[PDB]
Design a protein around this ligand. Structure first.
Ligand code: MET
Ligand code: MET
Ligand code: MET
Ligand code: MET
Lengths: 15, 15, 15, 15
Protein backbone atom coordinates (compact mmCIF):
# COMPACT_ATOMS: atom_id res chain seq x y z
CA UNK A 1 0.00 0.00 0.00
CA UNK A 2 1.16 3.50 -0.92
CA UNK A 3 0.92 6.67 1.13
CA UNK A 4 -1.03 9.33 -0.78
CA UNK A 5 -1.17 13.00 0.25
CA UNK A 6 -3.66 15.67 -0.73
CA UNK A 7 -3.97 19.18 0.68
CA UNK A 8 -7.27 20.55 1.91
CA UNK A 9 -5.53 23.43 6.05
CA UNK A 10 -3.45 20.25 6.21
CA UNK A 11 -2.68 16.95 4.52
CA UNK A 12 -5.37 14.41 3.76
CA UNK A 13 -3.56 11.09 4.15
CA UNK A 14 -4.53 7.97 2.27
CA UNK A 15 -3.08 4.61 3.31
CA UNK B 1 -12.67 15.62 -5.41
CA UNK B 2 -9.01 16.04 -4.43
CA UNK B 3 -5.69 15.53 -6.15
CA UNK B 4 -3.44 13.04 -4.33
CA UNK B 5 0.25 12.36 -4.87
CA UNK B 6 2.25 9.30 -3.87
CA UNK B 7 5.71 8.20 -4.95
CA UNK B 8 7.13 4.81 -5.74
CA UNK B 9 11.19 6.35 -8.52
CA UNK B 10 8.53 8.92 -9.40
CA UNK B 11 5.12 10.37 -8.64
CA UNK B 12 1.89 8.38 -8.56
CA UNK B 13 -1.23 10.50 -9.06
CA UNK B 14 -4.58 9.87 -7.42
CA UNK B 15 -7.97 11.48 -8.06
CA UNK C 1 -3.64 2.72 -10.62
CA UNK C 2 -6.38 0.87 -8.73
CA UNK C 3 -10.02 1.78 -8.41
CA UNK C 4 -10.97 2.14 -4.73
CA UNK C 5 -14.56 2.39 -3.48
CA UNK C 6 -15.87 3.69 -0.18
CA UNK C 7 -19.49 4.29 0.80
CA UNK C 8 -20.63 7.57 2.28
CA UNK C 9 -25.45 7.92 0.03
CA UNK C 10 -23.22 6.59 -2.76
CA UNK C 11 -19.74 5.43 -3.67
CA UNK C 12 -16.70 7.61 -3.12
CA UNK C 13 -14.42 6.65 -6.01
CA UNK C 14 -10.66 6.84 -5.83
CA UNK C 15 -8.60 6.53 -9.02
CA UNK D 1 -11.80 8.91 7.51
CA UNK D 2 -13.34 6.27 5.24
CA UNK D 3 -12.68 2.62 4.53
CA UNK D 4 -11.90 1.94 0.86
CA UNK D 5 -11.76 -1.40 -0.95
CA UNK D 6 -10.04 -2.24 -4.21
CA UNK D 7 -9.23 -5.60 -5.74
CA UNK D 8 -6.24 -6.84 -7.65
CA UNK D 9 -6.94 -11.90 -6.92
CA UNK D 10 -8.18 -10.38 -3.65
CA UNK D 11 -9.13 -7.26 -1.75
CA UNK D 12 -6.87 -4.25 -1.24
CA UNK D 13 -7.83 -2.10 1.75
CA UNK D 14 -7.47 1.66 1.94
CA UNK D 15 -7.87 4.01 4.90
C1 MET E 1 -3.30 1.63 -0.30
O1 MET E 1 -2.43 1.61 -1.18
C2 MET E 1 -4.04 2.91 0.07
N1 MET E 1 -3.41 3.70 1.11
C3 MET E 1 -4.24 3.82 -1.15
C4 MET E 1 -4.81 5.19 -0.78
S1 MET E 1 -6.33 5.16 0.22
C5 MET E 1 -7.51 4.60 -1.00
C1 MET F 1 -11.76 12.12 -5.15
O1 MET F 1 -11.53 13.05 -4.38
C2 MET F 1 -10.70 11.08 -5.45
N1 MET F 1 -9.60 11.62 -6.24
C3 MET F 1 -10.19 10.52 -4.13
C4 MET F 1 -11.26 9.78 -3.36
S1 MET F 1 -10.68 9.32 -1.74
C5 MET F 1 -9.77 7.82 -2.11
C1 MET G 1 -4.24 5.18 -7.93
O1 MET G 1 -3.96 3.99 -7.76
C2 MET G 1 -5.37 5.85 -7.16
N1 MET G 1 -6.68 5.77 -7.79
C3 MET G 1 -5.50 5.29 -5.74
C4 MET G 1 -6.74 5.82 -5.01
S1 MET G 1 -6.92 7.62 -4.96
C5 MET G 1 -5.62 8.05 -3.82
C1 MET H 1 -9.14 8.67 5.07
O1 MET H 1 -10.35 8.77 4.90
C2 MET H 1 -8.30 7.73 4.21
N1 MET H 1 -8.58 6.32 4.50
C3 MET H 1 -8.58 8.04 2.75
C4 MET H 1 -8.13 9.43 2.36
S1 MET H 1 -8.65 9.83 0.70
C5 MET H 1 -7.37 9.04 -0.26
Amino acid sequence: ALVFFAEDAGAIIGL
